[PDB]
Design a protein around this nucleic acid. Sequence first.
DNA 1: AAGCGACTCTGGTGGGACTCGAACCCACAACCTTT
DNA 2: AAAGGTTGTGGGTTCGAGTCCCACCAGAGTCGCTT
Lengths: 542, 579, 689
Amino acid sequence: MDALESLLDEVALEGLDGLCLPALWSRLETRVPPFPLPLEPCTQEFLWRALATHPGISFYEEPRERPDLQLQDRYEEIDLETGILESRRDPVALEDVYPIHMILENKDGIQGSCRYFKERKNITNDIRTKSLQPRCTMVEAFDRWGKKLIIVASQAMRYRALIGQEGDPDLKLPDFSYCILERLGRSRWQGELQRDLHTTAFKVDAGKLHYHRKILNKNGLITMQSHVIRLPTGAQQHSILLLLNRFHVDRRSKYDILMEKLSVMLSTRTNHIETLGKLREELGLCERTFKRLYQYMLNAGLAKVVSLRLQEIHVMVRCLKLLKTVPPVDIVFERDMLTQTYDLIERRGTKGISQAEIRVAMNVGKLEARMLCRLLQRFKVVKGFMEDEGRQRTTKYISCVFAEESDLSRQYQREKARSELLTTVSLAAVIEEVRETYRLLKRRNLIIEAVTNLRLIESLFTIQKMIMDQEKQEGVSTKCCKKSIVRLVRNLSEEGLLRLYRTTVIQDGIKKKVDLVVHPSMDQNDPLVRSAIEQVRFRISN
Amino acid sequence: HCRGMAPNGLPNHIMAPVWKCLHLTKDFREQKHSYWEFAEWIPLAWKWHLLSELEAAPYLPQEEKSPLFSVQREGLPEDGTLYRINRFSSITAHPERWDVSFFTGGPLWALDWCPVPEGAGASQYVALFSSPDMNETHPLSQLHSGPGLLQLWGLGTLQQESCPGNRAHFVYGIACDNGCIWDLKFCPSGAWELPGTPRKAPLLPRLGLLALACSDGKVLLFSLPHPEALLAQQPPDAVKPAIYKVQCVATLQVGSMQATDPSECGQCLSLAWMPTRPHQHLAAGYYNGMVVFWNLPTNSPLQRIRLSDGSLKLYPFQCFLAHDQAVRTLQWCKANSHFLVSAGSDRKIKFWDLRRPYEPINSIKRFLSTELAWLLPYNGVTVAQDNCYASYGLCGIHYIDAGYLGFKAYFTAPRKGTVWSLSGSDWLGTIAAGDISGELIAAILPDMALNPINVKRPVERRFPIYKADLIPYRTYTETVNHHYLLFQDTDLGSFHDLLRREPMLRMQEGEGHSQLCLDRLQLEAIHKVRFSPNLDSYGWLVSGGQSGLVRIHFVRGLASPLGHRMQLESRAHFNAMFQ
Amino acid sequence: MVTRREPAVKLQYAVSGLEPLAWSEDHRVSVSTARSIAVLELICDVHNPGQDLVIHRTSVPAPLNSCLLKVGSKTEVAECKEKFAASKDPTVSQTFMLDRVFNPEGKALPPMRGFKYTSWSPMGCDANGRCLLAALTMDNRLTIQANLNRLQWVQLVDLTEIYGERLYETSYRLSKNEAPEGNLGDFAEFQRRHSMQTPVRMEWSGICTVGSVLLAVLFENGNIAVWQFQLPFVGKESISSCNTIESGITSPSVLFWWEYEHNNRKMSGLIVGSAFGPIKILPVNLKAVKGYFTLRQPVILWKEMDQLPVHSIKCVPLYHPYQKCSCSLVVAARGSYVFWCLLLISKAGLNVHNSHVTGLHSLPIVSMTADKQNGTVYTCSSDGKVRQLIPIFTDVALKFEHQLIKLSDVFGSVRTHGIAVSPCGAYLAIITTEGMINGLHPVNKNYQVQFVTLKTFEEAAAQLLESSVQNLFKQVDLIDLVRWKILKDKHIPQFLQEALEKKIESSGVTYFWRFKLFLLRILYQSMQKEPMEEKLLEIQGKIEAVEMHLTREHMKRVLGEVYLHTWITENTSIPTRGLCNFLMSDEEYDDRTARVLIGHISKKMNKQTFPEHCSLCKEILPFTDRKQAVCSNGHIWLRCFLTYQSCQSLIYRRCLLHDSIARHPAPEDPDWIKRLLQSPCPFCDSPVF
DNA sequence: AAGCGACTCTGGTGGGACTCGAACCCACAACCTTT
DNA sequence: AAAGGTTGTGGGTTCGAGTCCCACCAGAGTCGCTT
Ligand SMILES: [Zn+2]
Ligand SMILES: [Zn+2]
């Protein structure tokens, strides 16, 4: 790319909040591919004239001086063991140069973040004539305004810098989704991690960032990778890496480059077998690293766990072997769509059908099938039962001819009555007290039984394990999450059907979270919770 | 705004648009109808072959007798008897109220009045189709091409001296091998001539030109003789249901010369003739959403070919993809035939300029719609909805301006059920609509040149004609064995104290609150409604439905001295022109 | 032969208007759509290895303001509109309120600001060497658009605005004696004043000769406005005339230019087709240019008035093998048929033959394209059929033979809203949409542009070797087929290499050296952009060698014109002595013609230095190397690849491929280098802009 | 007074966007788990 | 004796569902001016 265009591109790769002059020189010096022309005061005046004479560039005074940029370099790119580790090595999270403040619903359609967007003033006509002749030298401009001089490229230039030449300018994006792009754009070759965007850039639910990120994936403006953060804990965290397509590079991983060497080694060894120690020794690897590689190769399905005697490799020796529904409805001319939809649901009968499965069967839009389900419920001809499957609390719809006899009805009615019994049987080192569907009522009832039969239960894992086995005996394929239990236990706490007591106990230089759950009839002073604390501390003792 | 009360009991500001529509319709037809068209397309006796009893048996609609029914008439003593009538037979008209009921043997799915020039005083006919089987139902996406019978029914002349003791007569039918008929349209004018017209023995005086939208994906065009001219040729001892096999004037279908590739268009769903002289274009809507136009007189070897039997096959001169889904209904503009409207199951109403088909004049996205009516004097169109997407309590019938006046849609009538069919009387400026509830209502529109938002209470402008109830006594025989149809007719003689009379309370308790029934055949449902287009009988309406009963009503309260005045003056002019 | 090319192009907005896809001589594809014109620019990218079509995307925005056709004073039109809308006659009132020409915006009418039609000029019409885009909205705003920079289209002129004013000044009379000052309050005159200036369709002429181009605009009433543009077109300044001819054709549907040559006599006319079916060639009786001449009398191609609307017209020049003379073939889409007519000048004058090729489609033809080099017709209908239709010469006139191409086999069940064909017939571009799925309607509609290979690689390679036009940019669509093969197989096919070496040996014109440079640069990208490193170094050495040869030939030609014009003793705009040194530097320079040329120049050259100075230093630039010059302080200035002057200006021109750079011409430059600076790039033949 | 045509004032629903609740997944330490 | 597959953990990912809340609708009410 040409030097003069690489300047204007860099000015457009910051967002609507643009650059200071010292930031611009820093951005050009840190450019990849390298900036063709060595910066010096006469050259910087020439580049400044290239900005002032360009009609799409515009200049503002912001009310306060901006911080100077950090050294952005995110990644370690070294190791003392074989290869190198390019995991994130954290700089200090100093006060952000570009804290985001989205320009929502703009009447001119210009988009991005700028904390001063309503407050800064244009000084274009002070820096240049309307005939685009520059009125100030760069040194005069920086003397007069300093960091308050902010350079911004026109929206057409900024959006072009995000989509490239192959991208389509006609595509409007929601303001939140556009502000994700320009948060990526200003990162250049080292994209923002999705973790960091929601945690500290946008400060939102991870669900919000994912939801708004969707459109950028759907239109294909950004590329997705898994990436690895090396914490000061020494442990390392998985997170998503977002790279704007211009800046996509296929990032490698230490375990990936080392498993490739093992894959090459085992695939070139004619037997595809070697002992772990030699697999280590040929790569110089420690067992702590290598056991990850071994289990990754196994979890990738590329190899199989094998053991052979030394006389068989030539005493048993551990080795690795490498090895690698509803039918569509024909709409009739002669009946209305409400009649025809009821005819469908009657054919399903006792099992019912979902709104999404109606939609596909009826060949209608999402909003159209929604209105069909609403009307048939309001007419009282069809009844809706919630059913949890997968991640989704769907509704299944059954005609009132069958609804009472349906398994969903019967199972729900049993667990409702069972719940009414289990509630009405209720009685009339430093502990802290915390603040419908068939399967959900089953899980509620099972916990209420447990706290009724075992007035204390020693951890949330105990609750999960019995629930997991109970659902596995029922044959449920989905596996209950810890968050689902603790949110469920929180619901029972607000209903007052149990206490959850939490603390950390300390013993022999180590600490354990306790998370006692107890029947409401006892407070944290009860000898039973004290006995539980003691018997936990005992088994935690060295 | 004109004050005072009309003698029929409606306010004059409510009746005044009805009285205006008489003159506007007369002034239009004088300019843009004609007394004779398509002079070559005249019926020939040798093209009409009478089927024997054995040959007709596959075509007759299969129910030999109606469901049992009784009619109660507002303010008369209760009848208490149950009627039941044979297929192709009629009860006698009620001596005071002249309603007639007749049975066609199957569920009525197409119906049109035979158009007759003003003042002619002719016998009045309806042509209709009723499906062969009461319970079979046909998919949209597939061609049917079964048998079916086109039925022509004479209603008498419908003069005041003729209505007492009137009966409908099944005059003849055409046995069609082209599947069920989804629409019927007669040529709007110039097709009819006096039955006394002297014509040589091979020829027959012409009653009309009738276009059939067939489920076989093609349009059929017939020229109809007057019945007496057929019966003069027919043997004297012939079978009394006169069923004929008839050669088309033309078969109209999508395609091109030597293009063997069968068209994707699917079933033909709706028709419109060109409303204005010489009516030379006919349009159809297709399941694929195309609107297709044929240039009926066309000599051109690229559009016309003559079959070995001598009938024409006509290929279209223009087609365009009007809708992204089946185009269920068309209306062609009367006031200027450069414009057409269509509605399709994508639930858009699209107005078109046929000079510039690449973009509609206006697309309004709405609820799913079944039929449209375009009354001559009003720039917009009144729409009947399928309820499956309307907000509960807001489903019904809407008038929608084409857009220049920019009014909001006018909610002319709330309905609980889907309105299956709609007809606007140009002569009356009133509209009538049939519901799966089995109720037939009429409504008077305001003068839609004026903003509808001033219409403080539209309920004063609507009234029921009748409601059919099933009275106990998902298939036809299981329903008929255990129910009968109670037809509750209103007193259309006047609208005095309307909002306190029981049929309005019954209707108002139906609107909004009543719940649709789905565990039955819908045997009460009404499927077609048609006001008479003729100035003679202009105040008459016909309707029919799932029962295969067809019922005729005279809306005496909307007939008026201006219609009588215009009938007498048109009679005088007609009697001077033809003798 | 027909297979899909990999990138489908997504469209954000509904495809809109008449015959909505077109492919320009400049390899920009425009689709007219409800909110923009999307322009797809095909680049034979030499900087990346991706096998897809490298489609650069730009768009013309739809206008923000609805166009009103001027029919009278702002007060008098307002009272007339009130009069008609309030009329108690159903016909007058509803005719006014329905017709969108009288009502381009309203309280509840959707604005018609999307595009009705688009047409691409010939090349060389823009201020750059590029073509202009004529764009017509559905509210009848006709505009000319250009992409002067790469990023943004700008409107150069609105022609409806000008024509409306000129009609108003002449009181809507073309002949001032011929018509009354008819009252605007009469609906026939009101409608006429709208109809007489509502544009239906439009086409550009070829380049007349200073260059000029015509634009003929067809109006609803059968008037045609023939605009004349001076070239390069820069706006209203370049509109040399507007002249209106009355065709008299009622309801004219479509227009195309006829241009023809016989015995080196130029002739031309306008062919016009009615929506009611007939087709007639008008003689363009009015024009100012002296080199062209016009047909003497109208000829009727189809007379039948059968009301099959003439939806499209195309024509192609041919040479008839048996009549042994040049002839013109006209093809026109009429309903579902193709009308064809062959026009042949002979001693008898025009000899004319016509027919309808029949059975093509069971629905009307929605678009048509002609392969200008062969007369191969393509035709399309919304059922997704596309039919290739090959003209076969007959002892007199033609026969057409035709075959369906199964888009089903490449895209599945599909609707097609338009087709276009690349200037060499290399690709067919198709506006695809979701088709009927086993008789069901598709739930959601999404327009796309998709491409299919019309030619095999071997035919594209052969046609490039035997190319009569011998410019690569005229043939981007063929060298893209060659590019796709090389990137796919990571080697140059041997027969192409051997044949190209034979052409370079036997003919050696710089076109073949440019073709070699293309193959080698695509080869370098193919092999992942140490035997691979040795191979990369080898072929990069070959690229540099042939790149150096093309430079030598251009430098020789530049000095080979400095010698011809008056000696620029001030050395004003060419580094003459530096170029002479660069052309004597090496013993490689065996070419005696260059050596004697620089001999004669160096005899004539001034002994005074007249050096080139670095503007940031006022210190000399030595002229060491082709691409760039440096001063002692270490500044780096690119050199103009057309004149080797250093591009020290803050704005300068860049090749379409960014492979080469050029200086802007300045008033100090003599005419001959102001002409030289209009050359295409010496390496890629692309516009240097 | 009785009536009219704007001008409000009041309960009800859907359109697209978006909160919601769930299982799913990383990579580590814990150690139960095995010859 | 003498040690590794097997598992639970805090946090992020993501998938389709139902929910939101504003604009719009249909009806009834207000009342300046007229009749
Ligand atoms: Zn310098
Ligand atoms: Zn170049």
